[PDB]
Each structure stands twice: as C-alpha cells, then as structure tokens.
C-alpha cells in the first residue's frame, strides 16, 4: 500500500488512465481510483488510501470477481503477494455411502492491502486468469482470529 | 437373580464391593483429629498419611506413612472429625 | 555469515536491515502490547475501588 | 539428596559462582557455604579449604566434578566451586547438610 | 432506609418484610456489619399446597455465603413475626438463551449463567444446612420426568417442615417436579 | 552437507585397501582422533600426541591411555580391581 | 489405559459428590491461599503441595474449598512454573534415564524404556503446542533440554 | 476407549435383556441414549430407568419390562435421504408394521414413521424392535 516503498520497481507502477496534475494542489493532491467488490464484500481503508497498484486487485486493479466465492486455510506464507490455500473438503463415495477427505491446494494472489498468515481462513472469489495456475483473488479475508492469534508467541 | 435394588443395596453390600465400582464413588478415606500431650495444637490428620506428620508448635512425629493407612506413633491419640 | 546465503556485503546490508526493520517492530508491538498491560487494564480494574462503592450504593441510598 | 535444594538456592537465595568471586565473597566474610566440585584441582580445593576454615564457614564437597554442579547450579555451563552468600526459603544453610 | 435494604426504590408493596428487619435495632451484636450490608433485590410469593403462602426473597449472592452465617439465625427470627409463611432464600442467577445457529455472536457463556447449572445451586439455596449427598431422576413412562433429590440426615430441622413447599416453588418457578426423600 | 555414505573418516584412502581393511581402520581412527574429556579439567579438549599419550590442551596434562582411546575397557577393568584389592586389605 | 505398557490398573482417587468443605474445616479461602503462597515459594510441585494440604492441614481441596484449582490460583499469585510438572518431571526422568544409558550403554531393556519416555514426552508436548501453554515451534532436543529441568 | 455411548447402551441392553435381566445399568449416561430411551419410553418398549447423577456424568440403571426383543446402533451414524428411508427400514426392520429405527435430526430425535410423517430426515442413531 502506501508502505513497503511500492515506487521502487523497473517501471511506473501506477494505476492506468487516472490524472495527474501538478497545477492544481488540492486536499490530498494524491487520486486513487479503488471500487467495491460488492456482493456484500467490504472496502478495505488500507486501500482507501492505498499506494499499492496491484493492477489485479479487485478493489484497485482493473479485474471483476464474477463467479464462485471460495474458502480455506494458508498453508504457504514464502511467497510474496501470492497465496496458496489449503482447501480441505469432503468427497461422497456411492458404492461404500462414507465420506472421504481430500483437499487441493489452489493458489491466489493477495491484495497487498490485507494481511495472510498460516493458519487463517481466508475467503477468495474467482475472476479472469490472473495468473494461469491463480484465477482467483482474495477479496475478504475473515480471519478475525485465523486458529491463531491467541496461540502465537507472547511476551 | 436379574431383580434387584441396586438403587438402595443394604449397607452389607457397600462395604463389600469396590469404591469405583458403588453407585457414586464415595471417598471411604477420612481425616483424623488427633492429639499429643506435648502440644496445645489440634492437628488435622489424612487416614493414609502419604507423608510424614509433626504439628507446627512442638516438632514432633505422629504417623509415618505406609502403603495403606499410617502406622501411628505409639504416643498418639486419635479420634475421627 | 560464516554458513552461505550472504553473496556479498550489500545482501548482507539487506538481511541486517530487514533483520534491524522487523526486529524494531516485535518489541514495538512488545511495548504497544505492554502499554495494554499496563493502561486499559491496570487502571480500568482499580475502577472496582474507587467508584463501585460510589455510585448507585451509598450515596443516593443513604436517607 | 543434594540436587533438589540448589534450585531453592538459584532462585531465592543470593548465590556467587566461580572461583574468584568465591574467594572474595569468602574474604569479604559473606559467604557461609562453599560447594566444592571434585574435578575442581585439589591445590586449588586445598586452600579453599583453607580460607574456608579462616572465615569458619561450611565447606561442601559435591558428590561429582564440576560437569555435575555446573548442571545442578542449573547453568549449563561449568562451575568449579559455587557459594552461597545467602539462602532463602532453602535450608541448606540450617541443616547439617 | 426501607429502599436501602430494599436495594431499589420499588416497590411499595412488598416493604413489609424490609421493615421488619430494620426494627430489630436492640441487636447491637447482630445489628451490625451483618444485617444492613444485606440488600436483597426482589421478593416473590408463592401459594404453598397446603394452602399457606411461601415468601420467595431473592438475594443477588454478592455475599450469600456471609447471609448463610446468619441465616440460621435470621430465618428463626423471620418466620415468628412473619408467621403462617415460610420463608425461602434464593440467589438469583442470570440466564441467557442458548445461542441458536441463525443467532448472531455474543460474549462467552460461561458455565455459572447455564440454565443446569443455576438449579443446582436452586437446590443449595432451597436447601442451605443440609448438603445434598446425591441426586436421582426418574423418567416416566408417560413423558413425565422427576428429579429425586437425597439428603444427609444432618441439620434436617430447619427443612423437615418446610419440604412440601421446596417441591412447590421449584415446580411454580421451573414447571419441573421434583421430590425430596431422605435415606435413613 | 552429507559428503559420504559409510566410508567417513576412511573416504581418504581412495578405492583401494579393500573394505574391511578400511571398515576395521575406521572404527579406531574414529577413536583415534575423537576429542576426550579431561578427568582433570573437565573439557572435552584431550587429544592423542602419540601412540597411548593423551594431551589435555588446556591445563596442559598428559594421561598415558591407549594407543586409540583415553583409556581402554581392558584397563577400566584395572583400575576397578585395583580398587577392591586396596579395599579389602584396608578394610 | 496404560499408554506404554500392558497393565490394567485402575487404582485412582474418587473424589466426594460434595462440592462444598466438610463442616469441620476451619479456614477461610484467604487463610488457605498463604499456605499456597508459602509452600509454593519453597518450590513443591502443585500436586506436591495439595498432599500437605490434605495431610499437615484440613485441606481436602482447591476445588471443593476455593472457587479456582491450585494451578489455576498459582497463576495470580505469582508463582507459575516455568514449564508444567508433566513435562518436567517426565524430562527430568527422562534425563535420569538417559544419564544411566551412556556409561551402562549395555542396557538395552532401559534404551527400549527410554522411547517410551520421549515418546510420551512429545505427544504430551504436541498437546500443550496446541492449546499453547508452552511457546509454539518448541522442541525436546533431548541433549540441553536439562537447562529446562535443572 | 468407548467410541460410542450410544453403542455400549444398546449393546447392553440387548446383552441383559436375552439374559432377561429385569433391570440394565449404562454408563456414562449422556444425553443421547437419555433422548433415545425416552423414544422408547413414549413406545412402552422400555420402562421406568432411573437416571442417577454423580458428579462424573453419573450413570442410569433401567428398569426394563423385559418388552423388547432387539434394539440395536448403527454405528457410524450414516447419513439418509428422505427417499431412501424405507430402502434402509427393509434391511432393518423385522416387520413394517413393527419395529422402528431412529433418526437423529436438527427437528429432534424421533422414530422413521413420525421422522417420515413430520416430514425430515438426518443420520441414522439406531433399530428398536
């Protein structure tokens, strides 16, 4: 977002098709286009006064989240502004009427607005290839507590 | 004989069978008040000591312990509280 | 240092100022927490002796 | 049956560790009990004993070389002789032992 | 001082019984630190089967265990100037619904607030000298369920009179029957 | 990282010699060069100067042991029968 | 039961039905926490000192008598351990275990014992991992976990 | 370990009443077969069982007609769908007319013919006939 020193890379990260304008200074002098996901789900404030361009956000990228909502668990924290959920689920097998346990690890990129870490469930809804093993986006991170905020090391 | 009041067995069969396996598992274990001539303290005293006892007023040993209840020392006097 | 994963002296600078960035923020979220400890708690639960016998107790119902 | 009351000493009672600040803890006559390792060289043990009976204070010989007290003063390293300058809710002080 | 003891200003009706304790003042031993302290919050009244009334006095338990020290002795003195009533001690308990699957989320319900628990503690406060040795329940064959309740036969004095009415207001309070036998 | 399977401190004799030549040698050279602790000092600095000579680095001692450990179980044995033989004329 | 072994054996207290102290017990709640106090401070394990309590004095228990256990109260006191006593006492066992096995290595019947110590240590240990009394991603190194025990 | 107090009741049910046992103990009492005798209450196939509760889930003791025949669990609790209820009573039941096999649901715990009167479905808990 505003942090992390995003204006640090190759090229110009910034969102396409805004104005700038060095003329006029006005209240904020700084324009960000974000828009809501809807269906219900929140604008984030660290992307209210994002900096992070993350052109396939969502909120501020030029993606639409039009399809299944999903849900899991981060199993991979190595990665940077991408995330891999461990999915696990149940599977109905016919001849012996049991259940089964199986589970995929989808992939998908985070918005540098929110915040992953192992052990918090995590909401993720699909939209175009974002890459072509992520196709999904991680629109609502419900982890008000992810398993693990009360666990963690104290002091 | 497949007819019988396991609600309310006589006294007989409690002290008969085992503490786990009554209707509720009732401590059959107490604890002793018991007295020395040499102390002006009252000392409250588990059947089974499980430790060595001395009263805090007069240092004094009063039933070692034993797998089961204390062998209490030979100038003690107990009674049941 | 001694062991691989330090190529050269500015990867170095890069681990220790990574290493110096978060390390400033544990014990900054160690003294945010302890700042918890000590001020809507510490006083907050003194609340109980010195208006819990104030209000709605002894002073209304005395007459 | 020695072990079990050091910890008692380690975190109540005041302690010094090590040779030197034993023989200025003996010499500034505030030390009343000594532990003395067996691996500890005898020379080095000998006049202990030595400036022990000068301050007329206890003087323990641990049952084991300093591999032994270093674990049972609870540190993991190693420690040749081991005063006690003070002791808490331990008794060693009192006791014979 | 009758809304003091009455710890709230309602209600008029039931003053006569928060009256009677405040003109026993010729107790100086008994007087202080043990009877003004008490404020219970609310008083009920219930008809007894045998056609007298039981008096239900709700105590909020912030020190019951100090009104149990003396309640052998207040509950003596209460029923001679209060008489053809019996006199009754509860500790009022908060109880909160159990949260549905459709409910959304609130604070923990720890366990004193659970409906089992606060009539467990119904019966300690219906029955304070004698502890309870154990409990039976009975389910009938009918739909209909009792809840047997045993007792220690010591200090059954105070309660041997009053047992017909602890059924009463348990049923009246709970829509639950219970009944109490004592072995021995 | 994990340098070698099973011939250890031996892989420096090249291929040749055979295996079990090199199997007997490796379990003594192990003990040959393993550091010992000092019965004396305490620290796990005693190394072998010679054939049955073991230098303690530090306090500068030297225990004649043997030619491959500090002291051998064939003389362990010693110094235990030693000690009952001493014991039972004193007392 | 028995997690390593083939026993049966079911001798175990059975505690009253009474939640309530006998009538004969005359000490407050706050004239039985300073026993607490001043035999925790001497360093006797939680169960150790309920034995005194229940032997030199009328203390059945903390449960029946205060409103909070012995370890629960310990925690306001001031005296918590530093690890729970059935990792300490189940490792320093274990170290006992294994200060036998490196000068009597021959003692194949207390090195097959020994697993049985680790192993119990770890399962117990993975239970306090995951309701996290003791620090998440912690280890039994088996070698300097005596500076855990002492 | 008990990996079904469900199980163990009707195991020892069965167990006392081919032994013809006027009377049955079942432990460790929980709710489940307390709601499960009441099924069988309400169908005169069991009778007066005192519940007694000890401070350690207690225990129950029943006082059993000698009335039924067979009642057992089907454990683990397999799921059913409202079309194959009767396809699971077949396999089950003596008799349609007689014998019920009950079905734990979110409504609550009832026999299959009011489970299929009210008109849900759930797992199955277990056959009394």
Known sequence: STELTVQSERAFQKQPHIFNNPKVKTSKRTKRWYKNAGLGFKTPKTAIEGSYIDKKCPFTGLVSIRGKILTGTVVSTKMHRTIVIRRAYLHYIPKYNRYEKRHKNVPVHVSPAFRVQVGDIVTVGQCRPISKTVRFNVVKVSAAAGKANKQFAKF | VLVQDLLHPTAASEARKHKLKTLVQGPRSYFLDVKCPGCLNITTVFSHAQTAVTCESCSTILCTPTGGKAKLSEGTSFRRK | SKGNAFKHKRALVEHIIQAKADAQREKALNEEAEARRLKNRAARDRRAQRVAEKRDALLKEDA | SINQKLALVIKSGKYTLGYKSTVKSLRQGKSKLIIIAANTPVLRKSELEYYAMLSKTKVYYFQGGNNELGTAVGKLFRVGVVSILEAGDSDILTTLA | PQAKILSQAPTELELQVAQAFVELENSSPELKAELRPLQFKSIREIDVAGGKKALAIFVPVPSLAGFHKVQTKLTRELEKKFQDRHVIFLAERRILPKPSRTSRQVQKRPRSRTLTAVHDKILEDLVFPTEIVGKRVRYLVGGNKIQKVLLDSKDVQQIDYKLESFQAVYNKLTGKQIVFEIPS | AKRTKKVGITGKYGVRYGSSLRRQVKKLEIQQHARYDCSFCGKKTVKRGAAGIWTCSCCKKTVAGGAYTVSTAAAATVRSTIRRLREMVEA | GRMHSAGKGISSSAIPYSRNAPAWFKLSSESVIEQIVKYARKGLTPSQIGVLLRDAHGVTQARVITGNKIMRILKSNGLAPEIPEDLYYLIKKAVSVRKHLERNRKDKDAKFRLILIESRIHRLARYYRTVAVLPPNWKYESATASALVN | ?129
């Open chain 8, 1 to 129: 370990t008990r990996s079904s107090v469900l199980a163990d009741a009707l195991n020892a049910i069965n167990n006392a009443e081919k032994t013809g046992k006027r009377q049955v103990l079942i432990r460790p009492s929980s709710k489940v077969i307390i709601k499960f005798l009441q099924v069988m209450q309400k169908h005169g196939y069991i009778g007066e069982f005192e519940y007694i509760d000890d401070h350690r889930s207690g225990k129950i003791v029943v006082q059993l007609n000698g009335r039924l025949n067979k009642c057992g669990v089907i454990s683990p609790r397999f799921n059913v769908k409202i079309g194959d209820i009767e396809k699971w009573t077949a396999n089950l039941l003596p008799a349609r007319q007689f014998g019920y096999v009950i079905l734990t649901t979110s409504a609550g715990i009832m026999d299959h013919e009011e489970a299929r009167r009210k008109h849900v479905s759930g797992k199955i808990l277990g056959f009394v006939y």
